[PDB]
Each structure stands twice: as C-alpha cells, then as structure tokens.
Design a protein around this nucleic acid. Structure first.
Ligand SMILES: [Mg+2]
Ligand SMILES: [Mg+2]
Ligand SMILES: [Mg+2]
Ligand SMILES: [Mg+2]
Ligand SMILES: [Mg+2]
Ligand SMILES: [Mg+2]
Ligand SMILES: [Mg+2]
Ligand SMILES: [Mg+2]
Ligand SMILES: [Mg+2]
Ligand SMILES: [Mg+2]
Ligand SMILES: [Mg+2]
Ligand SMILES: [Mg+2]
Ligand SMILES: [Mg+2]
Ligand SMILES: [Mg+2]
Ligand SMILES: [Mg+2]
Ligand SMILES: [Mg+2]
Ligand SMILES: [Mg+2]
Lengths: 178, 206, 116
RNA sequence: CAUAGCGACGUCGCUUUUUGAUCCUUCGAUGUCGGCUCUUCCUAUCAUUGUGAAGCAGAAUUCACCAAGCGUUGGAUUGUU
RNA sequence: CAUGGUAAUCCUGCUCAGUACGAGAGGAACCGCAGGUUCAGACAUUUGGUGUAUGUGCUUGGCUGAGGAGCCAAUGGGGCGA
RNA sequence: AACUGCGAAUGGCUCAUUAAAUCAGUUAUGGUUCCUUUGGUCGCUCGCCACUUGGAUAACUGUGGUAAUUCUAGA
RNA sequence: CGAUCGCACGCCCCCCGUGGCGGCGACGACCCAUUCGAACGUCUGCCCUAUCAACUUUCGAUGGUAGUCGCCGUGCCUACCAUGGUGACCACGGGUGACGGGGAAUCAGGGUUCGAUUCCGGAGAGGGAGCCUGAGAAACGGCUACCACAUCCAAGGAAGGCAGCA
RNA sequence: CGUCGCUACUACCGAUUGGAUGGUUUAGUGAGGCCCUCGGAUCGGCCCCGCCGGGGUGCCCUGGCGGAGCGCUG
C-alpha cells in the first residue's frame, strides 16, 4: 500500500512504498481529516503527526469524506460535491466512491504532515519549492508587503524573471487588478 | 410528478380520455406547504419563468389589520380556531388562506390608548402605573385636550371585541396565501362575520 | 482462524458456527444463530432490537479552532527578498511616497506645460 | 464347419415354484386371496470375486466352472398374484 | 478362554490413456489417488427437530377495587429458547 | 489552456400513439408567463475601505490509483 | 437602489500645484411597455361499426362552498355538501392497413378515392417512469431507476441508445 | 333431382377445466427521483487571551508561536 506523503509548508510531495502490516496498522480504522502520530513508521518518522487526507481504493476509486463506511458505495454526485466534474451545467451522475474509513484494501493513502518531527525527512522537508506566481490583487500584495496606503504599489509587485537559451532576457509582471 | 393536467379526467359525457402525450413540465404540481405554527421557516422554490415562491413551512407572526380603526400591526399568531375547509386543519394547527386564527391584541391595545386615551382590556387599573399614569394625564395643553376629548365621542368598541380584548387574544381571518407568498397577513374579525364565526365555534364545542 | 464474518446482529461468527443464507437476487447473508436468522427472515429491523450492535451504535450506548498560515518564497523573490521589501517600515516608505509624489509633480508640471 | 453357439426325428431323466389326478389327515372349525412388515433357507447365478471357452482384435456380448458372501431398487394402472 | 455369534458391500471420477488393440470407427486393464451407494457401530462440537426448564418476552377473554404482581381457559395462543 | 457569459429546448428524422383527441378556421386571456431585441426607468429612498472590501477556485508545478472511461485524489 | 470593461483625450485653477470636472461607448440591471412566442380556453367541423343501447358515479362522475397546488381560470387536487352529467340529433365501447390540415389522383355537373412524404400544427427518440440546470425540456447527440437487447473486463467494475448524415 | 361409394378443396361443431402471441387492468411486492422532518463526517468567524508584546502613555495600536474559549456561532 503506497503512501503519498506531502508537507504543505515546503511542498515536495513524495510517494512511499511500504508493505508491512504492523507499520500500517496505526492508520487502520481512522476516518479522513484526522491527525494521527505517524511514529509507527520506524525511527525516521518519529515525532511526526500526519493527517489522513484521502486515498484510492484497490480499483482506483477515490474516497469521499463523510461516507462513513468501508468499501464502495454509489452516490448521485452533483456539481461541486467531490470526485466529479459536470460535463454540462446541472448534470448529476451516479458514481462509485470509496468510504472515508481506511483499511488494508487500498492502493494509496494520501497523508499530510501537520507538525514537524525532530529531524528532516530526506527529499521531503528540504529543497523548498517556491510558490510560482505571487498575488495579483492589489489588496493581496498590500497584505503581503505590509503597505499602509498607496506607497509604490506598482513597483512592489512581484516581477517574474524568465530565461531560455534562445530567449532574449526579459522580465514578466502581472496585470494587477482592483 | 404531481400533474395538474385536465386530460387525465373523464370527458363531460363520462367517456375515457386517452392522453396524446406524456406528462409535460408546465402542467406540474408541487406538494402542499402545510404551514404550521412555530419559529419562522420559509423555503424558496423556483417556478415558471425563473420567478420566486416562498413556502412558509412554519410561521409565528403576521400582519393583521383592524380595519374599522384602520390599525395595521404586526402581531403574533397563537393557534387556529376554525377552518371552513377541513376540521383536520384546525386540529393540526395549519395556516391556510381562509382559516381564522387567534392573534395577540397587545399592539392594537397600545394603539388604542395612544390614539383614544381610554382603558382597553383592563380590569381595575393601577397595575402599569409608570406608563398608564403618564398616558392618561399627559398634562397636555388646551388644544391637545380639545383634540383628545373631540376623539372621545367615537371611542366605542363592540362588546364582542371588548370581550376579546379582555381575554387578551383577538381572533382574525387570514387573507394571504402561505406557501405562495410565505406570510400570514390578514384582518381582524368584527361585526356580523365575527358573530357568525363565534356562533360556529360555540356550536362546534360547548 | 479463517475469515471472520458478521451477523444480522453484527456479532463475530467463528468457524463452524451459525448458518449462511444465499438469496435468489445474489446477496449472501450469514447468521450467528437461529434467533438472528428468524429475526432477519421475519424482516425485523436490527436498529430496533435492543441487543443488536446496530441498535447500540444508533443509540450511542457505551460510547477546537485551528488556523495557521506560513510564509513561503516566491519564484523571483526569495524569503530574504520579501523580508527586505516588507521590513521597510522605519520611514523609508515615507521617503518612497514623498519622492514618488514630487516626481509625479514635475511630471504634472510638464503635462501642464504641454497641455494648454 | 454336426457339436463357438444351437439341435430336427427320436429317446432318458430331474423338480414339486404350474395345473391336474386321488380323497389318506382335518366338518363337537387348523380363520380362506393379495398387499405391508420381518427373518431365515435353496440354487436351477442377474450382478459382484476367481476362472475356462468363442464365429473372444479392442469395446460389447455369448457358453461353462468353483460359488449363495453380498445385493437385486423408485413409481403410473390394476384388489390383484 | 471353552463355547456361541460375527460384517462389511458395491460403484463412480482422475491417472494409466485417445495408450494397448484396430484400416477406421472406436477403445480397455494392473498399480496409484480422490470420493460415493447400501449396511453396521456410535456420537451431539456444529446444523436441524423437540421442548411444560411451564425459562423469558408478547397477547385474547375473564378474575383478584386499580397500579404492581399474578392466576384460570383439561399445555389459552404465539416468538425465541438452556 | 482554463474560469465566466451565451447556445446547446432551434434545426434534422420518423408517423408508433392519438377519433372532439390532434388539427383547420374563428374568438379570448378584463384568467397567465416570457430569454433576446427595441423603448421607457436607474442622485425620486434622508439612512477608521469608498481613491475600490473578503475568501476560495480553475488554468499551471509536482505526487499518484485503476485493466479500463471525456474517471479523477492528495499537496 | 451599479465596488465592471474599452476609446481618443481635454477644462478649471482663485483655494493654489493635487485635486475637481468632462465626451463616445460596452456590460449591467428591480419594474413597465414592445417583439418572438408559448399555454389553457370559446363556436363549428372527422372514417367504419348496434353480432357496441345505455354510459359516468366507492377510486371525481356533474355542480356549489372554502381552500391546496399551478405561471394563471377551472375537481387540478382536498374537505364538506347536493345528485347530478351524457345518450336513436348514435352517447359509451370496438376497429382503423388513422398523425390533422394546406393539398394529390380521377374530371360535364355532382362526386369517389389518396394525403407516411420537404409548408403549418402535433407526437416520439428501444418501452415505460422520475428529475437537475435553464426564460424556455418532463430534453434523451442531459441525468437517474426498472424492463428488453447489448459492448469491454485483468471478472473488482465501466460504458450504451443512428424514427440525424452516410 | 337426391341418397350412397371414391378423390380433392373450403369452412363448421367438438372432449382436450386445449395452445400461442398481443392489449387493458385488480391485488401484492416495489427501484429511483422529488418534497418534508431529522441527522451532522467535515469546513470557517467570534469569544483570541498560557505569552512575550505594548502607545495615545500594570492602563496593548498589535506585529506571531501557542494552549484552546472546551462556548457562541454560519
Ligand atoms: Mg479590471
Ligand atoms: Mg378308497
Ligand atoms: Mg381355533
Ligand atoms: Mg391357529
Ligand atoms: Mg451350481
Ligand atoms: Mg469362535
Ligand atoms: Mg452374513
Ligand atoms: Mg388478559
Ligand atoms: Mg397489570
Ligand atoms: Mg371447563
Ligand atoms: Mg422452537
Ligand atoms: Mg439565460
Ligand atoms: Mg398509425
Ligand atoms: Mg400528411
Ligand atoms: Mg413537420
Ligand atoms: Mg419529446
Ligand atoms: Mg426522456
């Protein structure tokens, strides 16, 4: 049962291959969006509290929050529920979804670290990938650079420097709104 | 679903009519609102043309007009006392268009002292003195007292309404349609209609 | 030691215990004893029988605020860069606004000269 | 090709599970058919064990020997045997 | 232990083997394995039956003034039941 | 590319159903709704952001599941 | 009771010197009117059949009263009442190898047959049934369920609707 | 002209509580949608307030960890 491990404060999600029942028993019979101390995955995962954020069934069916069962059910899914995007407006389609309780019968199990452990997981907590593009709204950059009122707002926007080999150098700035 | 078509009915001669099409949307129906009495709960349904209808599922207040006195106050509905259509609507306390209900007389009373300067519904007085003492005397001038005692000659209320004010509850007939407008507006029963409904309620019980 | 099954009452059914019932529609049920089997066959609802597990969990028998935000670097502006930008409070920003205002002032004087 | 398997014309026997023949016992009474149930016995063996023979290539079948240990059923119609 | 009784029986499938034999069509057997039929001797862990433990609920008519607790109706009836 | 808006209820096909039903002419909606167009109306209301307020989500980066789909999940 | 988007850009400067004014549009709107309509209504009109003469009426049949619901008028539905309503001037039932009409064939006059078929109106998308969105659908080159067919599967599931053009 | 005898064809009656395929329905079961009454897996705001902080001057303008107020709420 693979584990898709992701740390939001740095990004750098990674997939973990484990096959030990004893290691995975700490997750069993836990609902989604619950924080469980992931200290059963050896010494390296000690001191880690992780949140169960979802997964997929043995047949690739994603799990839906609030189903409150183990196994698969069929639900009439409307716009904006989960596990479904409407092909046309107002369309609702019946689909199969996995329950929120996790057991051995899964392919993956999406996990999100809530609080940091005592050491650094290799390839996970390091090499912090930045957020690509900064705020576009004027208020959202006022909050980010702590502006009071109208102090060089135009030039305090984030400029995106992009380079390619055949490209002649140039910077890119967004059209700031509101 | 619930259809309001005329083709499922028999012909005037009694012959069986055969439908030439399956059920159409514009000839639909919807479940009854069944407006009870309780905390305000109104549901919005979409209707033909994209307009809006209000399903008053539960109501507690309604705008009832005195009529004779041209007094229109937002008061509280207590219970349903009589319904011409069905007795079960009285038993289940369901608000429909023509059922008559008991409503509080407090705002109408307050308007009556504030306009006519007469006790109404009181038994002996001297019970709300820091307000009624002020509103009886008012130490007002000659012209204001001239207006007030000019308004005394027409300050007669029917003994039936006087009894209802003594009891503290007026009985009034709804005029709006809950489940269509989502409110319970109405008018205070008085005169011959009040006597007719009083005789109906008396003949029903006791 | 085999696969453990659950009954009409939700109890564990050990190997060699109870019966198993396969319906025509393709559903297979297993019962712990003839009491549960007779209750199921008489179409009695387990949520209304006091000793079944479903009733116990229906009647609850026997059994805060968090909001944290982090600051991250942006492509083209590191954490050091954004800290340098956002920590210009001690009247440096006043210098920026006043110099921008006076620069726009000579710009507006040029506009007035070339306008009328 | 008489005799693998049959056997005409004749002729010698065995059995008492057929029906007769007789009238010895029973007429101061031996309860008279069939079915059901249940046990045992016979072999003139349908099957099964071991065999011999064939017009026994195999398969199937037929004849015979030792042989009665074991088995020989469920029903429609009929009181039926 | 004298003596007496005595009991086990038959079939099918797989393999041998589409093999031997046969022009072909067809088509075995010995050893081995897995099971059944009839019979016999038991036994109740499980499944089923019984059930007046007159065990525990439900319920009709009646009776103890009512509640509670009960009883009668040749086992009142019914569900589950050691 | 995607979010949003609009269209997708027109067109095309066929004649099974349907015998005061459809339909044809006539008349009514003073018993109803109406996208769009066009034209009115939009300072009529006395009542520490307005030099412009808040949050999320697409598209996008990355990690995947299922044999499969115009399936989608986590970050 | 507009926190929207483009186009050229101009005017006032006393108070001053950074602010206030301005045109052309686009988008937008509660409501009204108009347009496109749609929906239910009024009167008259349809082939054969009595070896179909009495139908409707508990479960609405005809009407009244009060409501419910519907976009609205109405038994559309509910409650309480009344006993009505339709028929030899053919009711009701059955058949149709019946979608209706504008029309087509035949042609003294009168008629008799045919109109699935390009225009108008209606109905349906395999048979039913139920809904989301939207002004407008009971939509099917939208969804859901059953029934009948039927596609792929790694057997755990998934996907269907040519009475559109070929 | 009719019976009778032969050969064809066409219908008719006929035990068989005959047979088949449509259609309309009683009754029982009853998927699914819609509505109502509940329900509450989760997701947010306030009360943050264990603290460093604080400025018109312990009396916070709050710039964050953090417990969680174990409530009010949508
Ligand atoms: Mg903009
Ligand atoms: Mg003699
Ligand atoms: Mg004797
Ligand atoms: Mg004897
Ligand atoms: Mg012998
Ligand atoms: Mg011996
Ligand atoms: Mg023996
Ligand atoms: Mg009793
Ligand atoms: Mg008692
Ligand atoms: Mg007796
Ligand atoms: Mg029993
Ligand atoms: Mg629209
Ligand atoms: Mg037809
Ligand atoms: Mg035509
Ligand atoms: Mg047409
Ligand atoms: Mg249609
Ligand atoms: Mg459809």
């Amino acid at each position: 049962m693979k584990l898709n491990i992701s740390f939001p404060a740095t990004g750098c999600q990674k997939l973990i291959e484990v096959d030990d029942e004893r290691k995975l028993r700490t997750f069993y019979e836990k609902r989604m969006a619950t924080e469980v101390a992931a200290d059963a995955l050896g010494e390296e995962w000690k001191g880690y509290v992780v949140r169960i954020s979802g997964g997929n069934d043995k047949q690739g069916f994603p799990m839906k929050q609030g189903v409150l069962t183990h196994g698969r059910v069929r639900l009439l899914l409307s716009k904006g529920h989960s596990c479904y995007r409407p092909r046309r407006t107002g369309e609702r389609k019946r689909k199969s979804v996995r329950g929120c309780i996790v057991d051995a019968n899964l392919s993956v199990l999406n996990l999100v670290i809530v609080k940091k452990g005592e050491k650094d997981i290799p390839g996970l907590t390091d090499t912090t990938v930045p957020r690509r593009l900064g705020p576009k709204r004027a208020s959202r950059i006022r909050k980010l650079f702590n502006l009071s009122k109208e102090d060089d707002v135009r030039q305090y926007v984030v400029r995106k420097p992009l380079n390619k080999e055949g490209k002649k150098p140039r910077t890119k700035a967004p059209k700031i709104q509101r | 679903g619930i259809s309001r078509d005329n083709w499922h009915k028999r012909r005037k001669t009694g012959g069986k009519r055969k439908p030439y099409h399956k059920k159409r949307k514009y000839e639909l129906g919807r479940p009854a609102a069944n407006t009870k009495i309780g905390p305000r709960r109104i549901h919005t349904v979409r209707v033909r043309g994209g307009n809006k209808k209000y399903r008053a599922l539960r109501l507690d207040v309604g705008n009832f007009s005195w009529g004779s006195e041209c007094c229109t106050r937002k008061t509280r509905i207590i219970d349903v006392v009589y319904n011409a259509s069905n007795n079960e609507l009285v038993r289940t306390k369901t608000l429909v268009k023509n059922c008559i209900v008991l409503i509080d007389s407090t705002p109408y009373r307050q308007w009556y002292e504030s306009h006519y300067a007469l006790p109404l519904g009181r038994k002996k007085g001297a019970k709300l003195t820091p307000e009624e003492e002020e509103i009886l005397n008012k130490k007002r001038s000659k012209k204001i007292q001239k207006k007030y005692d000019e308004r005394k000659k027409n300050a007669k209320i029917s003994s039936l309404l006087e009894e209802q004010f003594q009891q503290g509850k007026l009985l009034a007939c709804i005029a709006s349609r809950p489940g269509q407008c989502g409110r319970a507006d109405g008018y205070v029963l008085e005169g011959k209609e009040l006597e007719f409904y009083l005789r109906k309620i008396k003949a029903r019980k006791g | 030691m085999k696969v453990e099954l659950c009954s009409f009452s939700g109890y564990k059914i050990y190997p060699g215990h109870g019966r198993r019932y396969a319906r025509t529609d393709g559903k297979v049920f297993q019962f712990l004893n003839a009491k549960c089997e007779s209750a199921f066959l008489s179409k009695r609802n387990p949520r209304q029988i006091n000793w079944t597990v479903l009733y116990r969990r229906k009647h609850k028998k026997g059994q805060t605020r968090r909001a944290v935000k982090f600051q991250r670097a942006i492509t083209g502006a590191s954490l050091a860069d954004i800290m340098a930008k956002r920590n210009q409070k001690p009247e440096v920003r006043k210098a920026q606004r006043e110099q921008a205002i006076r620069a726009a002032k000579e710009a507006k004087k040029a506009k007035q000269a070339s306008k009328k």
